Design a protein around this nucleic acid. Structure first.
Ligand SMILES: [Zn+2]
Lengths: 52, 129, 149, 134
RNA sequence: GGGACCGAGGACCGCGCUCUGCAAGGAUGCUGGCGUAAUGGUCACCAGCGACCCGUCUUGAAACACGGACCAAGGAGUCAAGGUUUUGCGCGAGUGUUUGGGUGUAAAACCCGCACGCGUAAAGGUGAGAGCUUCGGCGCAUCAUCGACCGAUCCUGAUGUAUUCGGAUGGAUUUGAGUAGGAGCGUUAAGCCUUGGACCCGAAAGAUGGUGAACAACCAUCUAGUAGCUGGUUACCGCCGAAGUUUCCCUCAGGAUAGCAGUGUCGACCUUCAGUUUUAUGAGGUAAAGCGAAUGAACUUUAAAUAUGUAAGAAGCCCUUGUUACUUAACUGAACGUGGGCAUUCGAAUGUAUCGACACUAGUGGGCCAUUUUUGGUAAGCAGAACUGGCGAUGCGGGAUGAACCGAACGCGGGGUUAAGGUGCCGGAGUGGACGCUCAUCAGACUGGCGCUCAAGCGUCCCACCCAUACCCCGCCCUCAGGGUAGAAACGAUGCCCUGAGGAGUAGGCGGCCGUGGAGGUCAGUGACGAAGCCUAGGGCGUGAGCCCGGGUCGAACGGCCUCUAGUGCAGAUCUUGGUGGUAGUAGCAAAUAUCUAGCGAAACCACAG
RNA sequence: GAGACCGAUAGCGCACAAGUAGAGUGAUCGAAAGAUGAAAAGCACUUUGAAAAGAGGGUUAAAUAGCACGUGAAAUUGUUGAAAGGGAAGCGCUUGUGACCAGACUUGCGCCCGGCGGAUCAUCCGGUGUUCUCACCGGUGCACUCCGCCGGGCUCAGGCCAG
């Protein structure tokens, strides 16, 4: 009788998607990147960028 | 459709009965009978005794003939076979010749009670134009 | 509107203004939408756009009727032969274009979007390259979706 | 021939019919359990019927009509006296109208309730006009 | 976190969840207020915004023109006969009692003896195909194809023949309003056509018979004559809705056919269909690049852009073999008989709320503007072709009025957001921001007026804001469509319940409903304790035509419902009759009854006003 | 003798003085016009004055039915009251002001005691009609049950609008 927005109503989202509770609980939307020292940009790429 | 054009109250009774049947059974026979009950008189031409006698030939002599029209007598037919016919109307000579041959005459409600789904029936239409 | 672009817009289920459809990028469909570029704006959606479009304005075609997708039983009943049993399978099949994209996109009614919050560009009846809104905006369509959904 | 007399009554003419311009038709028949012209409430087009009527003495009766007396217009109704106790009268209606359509049973209980309420209201009104003198 | 708008439904059922009950298939809880007035309504006035005088006719559209002093009553597609289509009904190879007779409670009703009108008379194979099935099959109606018979026609020309008659056998590219298991008769309702006054009103005439005079005229009738051409043609609501073109024939003064809209039947049914893309393909190798490849836009390895035909499997494919009436030297091809396997990519995309055939029925045959391509001319405009889009038949937002053009197409409302266009004031929204230019003795304005000059001008860029009948969410109305509803329902199955989509409209088509006079039935209807009518700065219902009630007047009849019937609905026709006005106590004292002042006293004209 | 006819602008031109009044030399043409009240009981008498007129007064159920006569619309007009206006009025949507009018939910039920009176209560008696097992009378009494009426007590439900 009345369409309820799952993005506004959390119970409707839990009805359609049972994973929403543990998606919010385990913070899979704030996942961090892989750890370790990132390498530096190659000089060739930099000399190609600032060409004539 | 939504209503029959006929003003015959018994025709509307048959229409209600076959609406119920068509709705509550998966039988195409009841739907065809309801469709022909909705149809006009020119679209329901009279079926003669000779046309039924022709169609009652191979293995249909034990079947019940169903005609949603009026069965008329045919003078060309000399011998009337034994036949169980269920129709809207029978002319007096046609009914007398059917019952004199040992056959039987039925209305559509007796057919709907004896054969609610149309098992072993022979649906026959009269000639167009 | 000339009769041939109007035929294209009826073939794409775009018979009203501010109407959205998902189209698999195919060179036949690409030529069709390049034909009706003077009337449409199109681009590449992300996961957020598809998710919020199906969750908020998702309507299915059940016996030719526009039924709101408020339960997974409707999606299972209408798309269970194709493996789509809930709304997440529908979002997965639309976003990652799977084998049954014809039936998943045809099951969805065309999205009746609102006017954008914030308006269009100052001259929207001009190509996106020339500072308008028509034609291909690519990923920028997400912003338009975020204004119209 | 309940259906045929119903078609004749409903679609052609009935002397007990009050047609209003406000979306409802009424039944002027005294034995109608609800004063409305519809298929279930017709006292004529239903061969088995039941109603509840109040005598001028104040005694309320249940009237039952069967098909086997339908050719006997002077013997159409059997009259059964209902108790002054409201619950016992409700059980009497339940006992006598066993295996009847549920519409007739429901409308009979409603009519008995309304008749008892009207009797109580009449007693209170008569007391008030006796006190006031207007 | 702050704000606005909304609360549809009404026992339970379902999906769920943070599970002793919850924000999970639509608002409850608490407090306060309400009768010397909560809340409405009517009239008058003021105020903000909006708004060309109605009907007819012509034009592509306007513009002109016609009619309109006012009110009451009247006022125009009717009735017959004959055809034709469709709905209902009775009987049915038959049907029709009503010329007439008998009978009667007497123009009613009831009965029918012989005729007569119209109609009827004088079953084959194969393949699809609704339906049924004992799962093996049987197969309606109808269609296609192969056959059968007949009136009659073309030869071959039997036994026979009265000796000049006949047609047996085998052959034909034969026909038919032919057969192949009858459909008609009567009646009712609606529509159309022909003729009668013929939807209503409107000539010059002509004829017949009379009346007068005095150098043809008038009267009555035929006659409601007729031809064109005008004017007019009477309640509401809902649904669907155009064309102003192809072809043919012949009068000029035009019809027929098809097209656009609609109805019924049959066949399938998302099979199939498509103003569409893609693939191959047609006319443009048209542009381009290269010719350190050849050759010479006509050069080309490659190849645009741009539009437009054809095909995309089951109604299909391929190949092999016989026949034929055909064809060619010849299965050289064509048709009729062959065989095989492919129904789990059955052979691109996307859409599919469907399409084809048959039959029947109204309104229409203007032109104009713009675009694309093409040809020719002029001092320049311009002229000839095809094309779609619109107007006629369209309201709304902008556009300085209009129109064109831009946006966007319309049920009644609330909220939100925009399009085109705008944000100095009129005028809702920025005297917003960055960079430059311009002082014009009537600058310029993506100016209308006021007015503006480090703009309120011009060019670009950025941000916020304003509002359409447009979009989104909710409510409500109607229509259409889908679904449910019987050992019956808690509502007339012509009822009820659930769900979705849609809503412009002239000519025109269909349906529903309101009102008037009279008739049959009914309401055991209202009424001299007051019917009908009329008046009414009262109360309600309906979207509406309308309907119901109150107050006053009044004095004899009247109303609802179901059917029947019609002289049945008015704003107009230089409409008819009656009544009444401005002009106007004016012009003038005139037929009837040279000024000032008593008494008397019009007419033209009149949509409303300058 | 009748009618699914017309009902005084209709129906014959004529419901009444109707082929009349009237027009034309003539042949001919040709209207308009019905309704007091049941009964004239048709307004006596007093008083203005020269009127087809008033004021008192009377008849009548009624005279705002008075031979202008049943009812008495609109156009148009006069008196009184209120409001507005002088380079058009009139209309659509929306508030406001003044005047007038209406008057919101028709505003109830259930329990617990005490008294009283009836009954469908009494396996009480008698009678009547019946669909023959259901109704209706007459007479008895309050052990039980059920209804009412009166005096106290309590709970609940209630229409609309705001926060
Ligand atoms: Zn009834």
């Amino acid at each position: 009788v009345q369409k309820k927005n799952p993005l506004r109503n959390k119970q409707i989202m839990l009805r359609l998607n049972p994973y929403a509770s543990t998606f919010a609980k385990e913070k899979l939307g704030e996942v961090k990147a892989e750890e370790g020292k990132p390498p530096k940009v190659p000089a060739s790429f930099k000399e190609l960028l600032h060409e004539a | 459709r939504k209503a029959p054009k006929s003003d015959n109250v018994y025709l509307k009774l048959l229409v209600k009965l076959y609406r119920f049947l068509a709705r509550r059974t998966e039988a195409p026979f009841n739907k065809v009978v309801l469709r022909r009950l909705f149809m006009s008189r020119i679209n329901r031409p009279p079926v003669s005794l000779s046309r039924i006698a022709r169609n009652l030939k191979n293995g249909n002599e034990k079947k019940t003939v169903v005609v949603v029209a009026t069965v008329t007598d045919d003078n060309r037919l000399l011998q009337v076979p034994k036949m169980e016919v269920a129709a809207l109307r029978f002319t007096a000579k046609a009914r007398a010749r059917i019952e004199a041959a040992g056959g039987r005459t039925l209305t559509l409600d007796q057919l709907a009670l004896e054969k609610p789904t149309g098992a072993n029936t022979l649906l026959l239409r009269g000639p167009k134009n | 509107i000339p009769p041939k672009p109007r035929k294209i817009l009826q073939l794409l289920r775009l018979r009203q203004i501010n109407n959205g459809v998902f189209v698999k990028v195919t060179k036949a469909t690409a030529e069709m939408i390049k034909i009706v570029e003077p009337w449409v704006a199109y681009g590449y959606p992300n996961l957020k756009s598809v998710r919020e479009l199906i969750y908020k304005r998702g309507y299915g075609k059940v016996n030719g009727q526009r039924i709101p997708l408020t339960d997974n039983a409707i999606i299972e009943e209408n798309l269970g032969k194709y493996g789509i049993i809930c709304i997440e399978d529908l979002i997965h099949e639309i976003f990652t274009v799977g084998p049954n994209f014809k039936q998943a996109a045809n099951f969805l009614w065309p999205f009746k979007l609102s006017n954008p919050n914030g308006g269009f560009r100052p001259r929207k009846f001009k190509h996106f390259i020339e500072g308008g809104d028509l034609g291909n905006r690519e990923e920028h369509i997400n912003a338009l979706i975020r204004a119209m959904n | 021939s309940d259906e045929i007399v119903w078609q004749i009554i409903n679609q052609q003419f009935c002397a007990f019919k009050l047609k209003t311009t406000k979306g409802q038709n009424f039944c002027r028949n005294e034995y109608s359990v609800s004063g409305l012209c519809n298929r279930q409430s017709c006292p004529l087009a239903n061969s088995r019927y039941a109603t509840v009527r109040q005598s001028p003495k104040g005694t309320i009766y249940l009237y039952i009509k069967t098909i086997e007396r339908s050719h006997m217009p002077s013997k159409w109704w059997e009259k059964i006296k209902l108790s002054q106790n409201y619950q016992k009268a409700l059980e009497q209606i339940d006992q006598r109208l066993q295996f009847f359509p549920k519409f007739l049973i429901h409308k009979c209980k409603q009519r008995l309730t309304r008749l008892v309420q009207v009797a109580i209201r009449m007693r209170r009104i008569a007391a008030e006009e006796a006190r006031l003198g207007e």
